[PDB]
């Protein structure tokens, strides 16, 4: 936590979310790369300890 308060680098997965927002897949096919990518990276979790 000391390094967290020191370091200027702030982490934000909204970069990943914005990069993958433009990627979407058809309404017919079942399996989809980008949905699995988002669900496995979990860009809504803010625990980076």
């Amino acid at each position: 936590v000391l390094l967290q308060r020191i370091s200027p680098l702030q982490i934000d997965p909204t970069i990943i979310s914005n990069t993958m927002s433009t990627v979407s897949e058809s309404t017919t096919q079942t399996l989809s790369p980008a949905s699995s990518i988002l669900g496995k990276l979990r860009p809504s979790n803010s625990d980076f300890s």
């Binding site: 897949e25 058809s26 017919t28």
Partner: protein, 49 residues
């Protein structure tokens, strides 16, 4: 369009938006900086028939 020639079938289409590390020429920086583009689509064979 290609009928039956594997040596002349398209494989990927890519668009680049930046130079990679230091080289200036796009003809040199395009190979390993582009981004593949393309999505599939499902039709109805019996409807077409």
């Amino acid at each position: 369009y290609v009928r039956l020639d594997r040596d002349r079938v398209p494989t990927m289409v890519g668009v680049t938006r930046q130079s990679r590390d230091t080289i200036t020429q796009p003809a040199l920086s395009l190979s390993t900086t582009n981004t593949t583009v393309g999505v599939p689509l499902a039709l109805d064979a019996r409807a077409i028939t």
